[PDB]
Amino acid sequence: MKYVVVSGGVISGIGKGVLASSTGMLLKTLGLKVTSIKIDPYMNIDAGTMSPLEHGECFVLDDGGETDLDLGNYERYLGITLSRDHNITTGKIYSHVISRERRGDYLGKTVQIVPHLTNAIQDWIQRVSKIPVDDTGLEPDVCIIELGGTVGDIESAPFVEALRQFQFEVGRENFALIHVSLVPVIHGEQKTKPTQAAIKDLRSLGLIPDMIACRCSEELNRSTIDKIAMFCHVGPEQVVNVHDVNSTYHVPLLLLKQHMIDYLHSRLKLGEVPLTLEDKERGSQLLTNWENMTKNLDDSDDVVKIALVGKYTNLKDSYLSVTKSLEHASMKCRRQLEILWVEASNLEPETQEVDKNKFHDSWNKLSSADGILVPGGFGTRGIEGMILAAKWARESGVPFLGVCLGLQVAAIEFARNVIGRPNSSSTEFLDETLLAPEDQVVITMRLGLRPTIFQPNSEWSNIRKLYGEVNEVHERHRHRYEINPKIVNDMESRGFIFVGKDETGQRCEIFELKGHPYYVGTQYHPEYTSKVLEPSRPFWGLVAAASGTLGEVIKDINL
Amino acid sequence: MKYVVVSGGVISGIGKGVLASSTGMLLKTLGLKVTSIKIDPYMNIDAGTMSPLEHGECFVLDDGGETDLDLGNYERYLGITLSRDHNITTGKIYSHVISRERRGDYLGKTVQIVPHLTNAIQDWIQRVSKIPVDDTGLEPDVCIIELGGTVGDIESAPFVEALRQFQFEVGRENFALIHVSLVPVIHGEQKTKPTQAAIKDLRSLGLIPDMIACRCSEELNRSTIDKIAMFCHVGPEQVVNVHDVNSTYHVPLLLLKQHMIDYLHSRLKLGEVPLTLEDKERGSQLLTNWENMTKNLDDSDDVVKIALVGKYTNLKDSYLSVTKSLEHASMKCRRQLEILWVEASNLEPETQEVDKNKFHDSWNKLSSADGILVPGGFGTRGIEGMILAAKWARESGVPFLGVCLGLQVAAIEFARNVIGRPNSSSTEFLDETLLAPEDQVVITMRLGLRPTIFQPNSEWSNIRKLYGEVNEVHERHRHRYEINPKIVNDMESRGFIFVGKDETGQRCEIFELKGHPYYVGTQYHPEYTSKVLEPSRPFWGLVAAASGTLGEVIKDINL
Amino acid sequence: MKYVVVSGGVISGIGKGVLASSTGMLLKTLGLKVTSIKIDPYMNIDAGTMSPLEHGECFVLDDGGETDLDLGNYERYLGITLSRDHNITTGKIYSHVISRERRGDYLGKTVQIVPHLTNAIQDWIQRVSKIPVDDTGLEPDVCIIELGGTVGDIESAPFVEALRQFQFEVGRENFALIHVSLVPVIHGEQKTKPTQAAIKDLRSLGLIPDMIACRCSEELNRSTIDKIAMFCHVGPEQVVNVHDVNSTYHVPLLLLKQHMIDYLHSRLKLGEVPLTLEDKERGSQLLTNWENMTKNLDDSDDVVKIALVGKYTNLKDSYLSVTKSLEHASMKCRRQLEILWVEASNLEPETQEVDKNKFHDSWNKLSSADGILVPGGFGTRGIEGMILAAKWARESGVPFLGVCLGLQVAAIEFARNVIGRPNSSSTEFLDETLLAPEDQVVITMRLGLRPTIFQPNSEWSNIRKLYGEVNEVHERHRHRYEINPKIVNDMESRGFIFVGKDETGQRCEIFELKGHPYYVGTQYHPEYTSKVLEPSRPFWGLVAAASGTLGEVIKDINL
Numbered sequence A, B, C: 001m002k003y004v005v006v007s008g009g010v011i012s013g014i015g016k017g018v019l020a021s022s023t024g025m026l027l028k029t030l031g032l033k034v035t036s037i038k039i040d041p042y043m044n045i046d047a048g049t050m051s052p053l054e055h056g057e058c059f060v061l062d063d064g065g066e067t068d069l070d071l072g073n074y075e076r077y078l079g080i081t082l083s084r085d086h087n088i089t090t091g092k093i094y095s096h097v098i099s100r101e102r103r104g105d106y107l108g109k110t111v112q113i114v115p116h117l118t119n120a121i122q123d124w125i126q127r128v129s130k131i132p133v134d135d136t137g138l139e140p141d142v143c144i145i146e147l148g149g150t151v152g153d154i155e156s157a158p159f160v161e162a163l164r165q166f167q168f169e170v171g172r173e174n175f176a177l178i179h180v181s182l183v184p185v186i187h188g189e190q191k192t193k194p195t196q197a198a199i200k201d202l203r204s205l206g207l208i209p210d211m212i213a214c215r216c217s218e219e220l221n222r223s224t225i226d227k228i229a230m231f232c233h234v235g236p237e238q239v240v241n242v243h244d245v246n247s248t249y250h251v252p253l254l255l256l257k258q259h260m261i262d263y264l265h266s267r268l269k270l271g272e273v274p275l276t277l278e279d280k281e282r283g284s285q286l287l288t289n290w291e292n293m294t295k296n297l298d299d300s301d302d303v304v305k306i307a308l309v310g311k312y313t314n315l316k317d318s319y320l321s322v323t324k325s326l327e328h329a330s331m332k333c334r335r336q337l338e339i340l341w342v343e344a345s346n347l348e349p350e351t352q353e354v355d356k357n358k359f360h361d362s363w364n365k366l367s368s369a370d371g372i373l374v375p376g377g378f379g380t381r382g383i384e385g386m387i388l389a390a391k392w393a394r395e396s397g398v399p400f401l402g403v404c405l406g407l408q409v410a411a412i413e414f415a416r417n418v419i420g421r422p423n424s425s426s427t428e429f430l431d432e433t434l435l436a437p438e439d440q441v442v443i444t445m446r447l448g449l450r451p452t453i454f455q456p457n458s459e460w461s462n463i464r465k466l467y468g469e470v471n472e473v474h475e476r477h478r479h480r481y482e483i484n485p486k487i488v489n490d491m492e493s494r495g496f497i498f499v500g501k502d503e504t505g506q507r508c509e510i511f512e513l514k515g516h517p518y519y520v521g522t523q524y525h526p527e528y529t530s531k532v533l534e535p536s537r538p539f540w541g542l543v544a545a546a547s548g549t550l551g552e553v554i555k556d557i558n559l
């Protein structure tokens, strides 16, 4: 079990996620069974009790664990599934030993943070990194660790001590540390001194960097490479840069041109770790696939505007897996995405009493859209606005995808306008109204992986064709409220077919609407299962409908 | 003797000189007899043995001491003259105690950096800060100290220890520390953490900041003011910012609007320090004069292009007192300066054999110039180029000022073209030629203040009118070579009058040429004696000739 | 050129000199041509301008350089001669680059402590360590460096940075660092935490210890070895202890039983450094000689009391080379030394007017003495007291040795009592008296190595027999005043033969007195040339006379 620990920096908010994930992807092109751990110095146990106003999406694993946003970046780049234990936090590990303490398992000793926490942190990393994360049951070869926070922090203190001991308990030639660092440029001069003071506080804590990765407003001068390397000892070929470039998917290609694989292959002796010719052939495949899809990102110019309809769209972090999944679809289509960020709070005509500009700006964006998407956040405040976007797409042929709250507002729109019961509602919005047509009932949330089965009369359905005509699908959920099962037989008689259901038949999970080019929704979140090199099928469909060639996409999938 | 010590930062190259000088100017508007010290952690004894390729101008005091560039900024803002002891350096203070040691003055003790250097540093600061620096013989009231380097540096180590002891040996309420700091902005967020880590290394060394001054790419958020103040303890009204604004002369006005006088008046009890009504009236005069001249800088738009002819003009730092003195002239004229940086190495027709573009670009700039200036650096390599600019100005009515090497190349041009001896030369360039017309002889440099006397037939001369028709002038020199005294009587018979001379008559120090609008030179450097609120008379003349109204300038001076 | 750098600690005053010298002796038993450098963070240039009240003896090299006491410990253990450049100091290296600066040799650059001092320190160590120090002209193999002060000190700051760079400029496997550290024991528990905090400040400065040497009130617990090694990373076999034992000459044998040679032989690859079978045979000889002489120190019990007569004998550090040379003599004689510390300020009868006890206590000690020694410090205040000890030894058969001031007071005693001129005097005490019998004249000091030649009528003389009957001797001097050459022919006619002289015959350097068992003096200091395994001949004589068997010593020398 080799380790690469990404770490460091003078500002927490600099460059670790993009680098760690890119390191993991690069090491995956060696054919190594790479795995990945996040260390979050924050106290939260798991993400379900924290709102999207901080650290973005409430991301979900096959385990059903609401987890840190940064796990999603490892899944979507590495092509792996992570267990809820691959996110380590301050309150997780303190809750762990305090649970073990009240259980009596410390045999009456005084429990001291050294060695006790620094043993729990090491034992957790050594448990977790052996867990299988691939399509096959084999244990991993190399673990990337993102140390969140900065080295030299009250809260990352037990984690840096635990890593200091771990660097000896699993030796040199089996552990390597990469430190991300700021290199400010002021008056056009690349001032190294913050990445010298931050290496005093690094070496004080006994960790030793084998690579320095810079974030800077420029490429590094040969002078500032030497000025880092002579003070903060690494070779001249072990300082690397992650400068501003318009594509995050090119950061693996920068680091490979800076020879980072050739250094880590030497520094972790990776040629001695056993691999087959098939592993090495999958390794060169992962590289050449990533080069070809980035060549498509380079030479593509034919824009496709997707309108993404929701709340808090000024905090663009709130829809990160949506945004990345749309880009995975757009790259597979060889077409340049733009996302129009559309405020559902503005589409409502009530906006026109308060500010006309917001109304017409939102409808300008929606009118411009080659496809529409209601991806669903949390809370009720924008539901009328999303019904307007569900209407516009139905009455105007515009492609549509309703994820989670998107199913519920698309069925509420269909009930309000095509069944024609003007009172029909989301029970989470309007429980006090006690309707017959409640388009929502509570069934405290169905979370993580579940099997979805298609209803037999569906060989005509494009959405099941995008899933390859298979009988069953496995995807990740978040829903407390669901479609009302009594209303289904009415909606299907109007052509709003619920193409996918739970095996019990009481819970309805996919629709596709007859005669419309492409109008779909999913009760599961298809964002979370997207991979960069193999995109999520409802999102590939939406961008393919917005692009044209949806038939050719389906034909190619059917081969 | 109160002290304000400017200090600090995470990068040496951030903001101390602009802030320290502005603090000193502001405290001068209280009517306090402000003085100023530079601490340079570099080893050089004094600047005469370091070339302009590093830290710029070889600046000169009334003492004749070649000293750090940063002394010039205190002189030109504060309106004071500094002794060569107001620049403290590592090799000055180590050479001082080692001189005292070999003299036997430590009574056979083992000389240890604590306390011995840290006593010498404190004794030097307490000697120096009492030295009179004004138009009157009174001792100073407040000393600004610029600690050069950063707190937390191998070489600023004895200086921070010496200040740590000094903060107790002259107490709180008589010493205050201002720390300059970086506040990076990354992804549009003002990341405080470098100004937290750098305050651990500050407080470790026992110093305590009473003000934090930021350099940042923006104004400070109210959030980042509170985030500094809660970690690095100062009040919310004691964090201040020195953001990018197009004028350095506005930095005193920023700091006054941020109430920095109201804090230092309280924190150094400055209301108890004895002052007269006349001192307070001079105090409000210094403020209102600085506001009115900056109002002129604000509402002025009529450009005046000065071509400054020399070498190494890509290192624009090399002519700093020239540049600032031209701006002191331009502000007094209410006219917006541009300096055309003109390469003498390009004006030469030999350039046209190597690159035509450089030639025509240099002559384009020179042709555009409302006035020309040969300010004189060091070494011979551009002398032919400067003779071409001395010719162009003479044959084309363009105003001219030849400082030091400017006199020598203007007299060499006059000898070559108006006397018409084509071989006449600078002996420093062409000593091997052994001419009769050597326009240069060695007289190892006449340095610092000397008296200049005007030749009696000079009531017609504009340059003596700009000096107020007085018999004598006191200015600062640097010259090893001078005009040949035997050639003078010939040049004067042609109308190149040497309007100013040494009292011995063998050394010729000013010329003015008959019939030309304004063609002058000075063997002394007039840059070094310029003040911001009272500009240097040859430079006020050059910008007044380039502007027009030179007669009105002379009339106003003659009142 | 391998390096071993001794360093470190939480208190400056702990254990470095005893360890460094013992390391050097041990590595000398490999047959390596070991050399040695002292780094003194104090500012003094050289020791002649510091008095014995601090850091003890004003020790002297063959170069004639008055140097730090600690050089003497390397000479007397390693059997080598050091140049005055093998002592590096803060004011030496700052005076060096400032000399190079005023000479112009930095080509006009701004001289900055990094890299400039940190290059001078590295260049000095690389010049110095190649200087031949043996009986043969070959360059050294391994350099011991004692870093004086502690790592983490304002004044040792350029030296720790210079070593940090040097550890890379001469790599790992060619440099190794040993850190001395305190391990306090409190309430009977060996508290490691000072040797953890001091290793944060070590690793912060980028140095990395390969050995930890402890000073502690006990042997180290196996628990505190593991508690150091797990925090301050070294193996369990790389923590070593230098506990209190009654003999400093056993510290090499402790460190060899703790396998320190076996670690440094591996860690510096010393088996690859080229040596002959003769070098290895001299290596095992140095070990077995040191074991046999320490076996003599172990089984010896027959006391020999030497009375050492002087000033400031409460600062026992003031006579260190005397004390060590007497022990080198005593070990060669297989006899247990005691030194009676005798106050010359008390032997004087004037003491009996102020305190009778001091008088009778001093004469009790002097009466008890098996031999007397006037070794000579500095200043005149005790000269009458030393004349009393010169008298007592002459009139009572007690063996005597007068070094430097000892010759002068023994000749002053002889002139006062055996020639019988009661006024005869030291001119340094009584210059105003203008005598005919001035027993002292100025000839500003004859320093370092000089040739001494024996007067031809000397085959009877025991002192020349102890020097092996050779015509000439080479020894180290310090004298400003000397014997008056006109008085010599009178003293010799009375049997006070000046057995040794300068080749010019005007300067008289050794005496031996007829008929007395052993009454000698030397104008040179024989202390400074003493080796542990080959003792200084006048001191071997004094302890042999005090022991008996002086004839057998002479017989054994004459083989």
Ligand SMILES: Nc1ccn([C@@H]2O[C@H](COP(=O)(O)OP(=O)(O)OP(=O)(O)O)[C@@H](O)[C@H]2O)c(=O)n1
Binding pocket: A012, A013, A014, A015, A016, A017, A018, A019, A021, A022, A073, A077, A148, A149, A180, A248, A317, A320
């Ligand atoms: N492989 C990656 C890595 C990062 N990002 C983007 O970059 C942001 C996070 O940057 P990251 O590289 O993770 O650094 P930070 O999160 O700023 O800080 P850290 O060093 O702790 O990761 C996210 O909003 C994400 O959209 C991305 O799109 N793809």
Ligand SMILES: Nc1ccn([C@@H]2O[C@H](COP(=O)(O)OP(=O)(O)OP(=O)(O)O)[C@@H](O)[C@H]2O)c(=O)n1
Binding pocket: A011, A012, A013, A041, A042, A149, A150, A152, A153, A154, A155, A156, B190, B191, B192, B193, B194, B227
């Ligand atoms: N002395 C301190 C201060 C803060 N933190 C940690 O800092 C983390 C936040 O990181 P970052 O955003 O990088 O620090 P901020 O204080 O927000 O500063 P900035 O404004 O630069 O983000 C928190 O988890 C907190 O535990 C720490 O370990 N030690």
Ligand SMILES: Nc1ccn([C@@H]2O[C@H](COP(=O)(O)OP(=O)(O)OP(=O)(O)O)[C@@H](O)[C@H]2O)c(=O)n1
Binding pocket: B012, B013, B014, B015, B016, B017, B018, B019, B021, B022, B073, B077, B148, B149, B180, B248, B317, B320
């Ligand atoms: N009152 C001032 C101060 C600075 N400058 C300009 O700013 C530069 C120096 O900036 P300064 O404020 O002195 O900071 P630094 O020198 O960069 O660093 P330090 O903090 O050590 O001063 C000079 O080239 C000078 O032209 C100026 O014109 N007027």
Ligand SMILES: Nc1ccn([C@@H]2O[C@H](COP(=O)(O)OP(=O)(O)OP(=O)(O)O)[C@@H](O)[C@H]2O)c(=O)n1
Binding pocket: A190, A191, A192, A193, A194, A227, B011, B012, B013, B041, B042, B149, B150, B152, B153, B154, B155, B156, C112, C113, C114, C161
């Ligand atoms: N550990 C160190 C390293 C450097 N210096 C000092 O740093 C000063 C140079 O300051 P600055 O330019 O701020 O440092 P640089 O090393 O040049 O780094 P940068 O590239 O950020 O300027 C020198 O006088 C040198 O004595 C120091 O005191 N301690």
Ligand SMILES: Nc1ccn([C@@H]2O[C@H](COP(=O)(O)OP(=O)(O)OP(=O)(O)O)[C@@H](O)[C@H]2O)c(=O)n1
Binding pocket: C012, C013, C014, C015, C016, C017, C018, C019, C021, C022, C073, C077, C148, C149, C180, C248, C317, C320
């Ligand atoms: N080989 C040695 C070493 C030391 N000493 C004695 O120990 C004292 C000095 O101890 P040392 O080991 O040099 O440590 P310190 O000088 O206390 O401190 P440092 O670690 O700087 O050497 C001297 O007075 C000396 O008499 C000795 O006799 N023989």
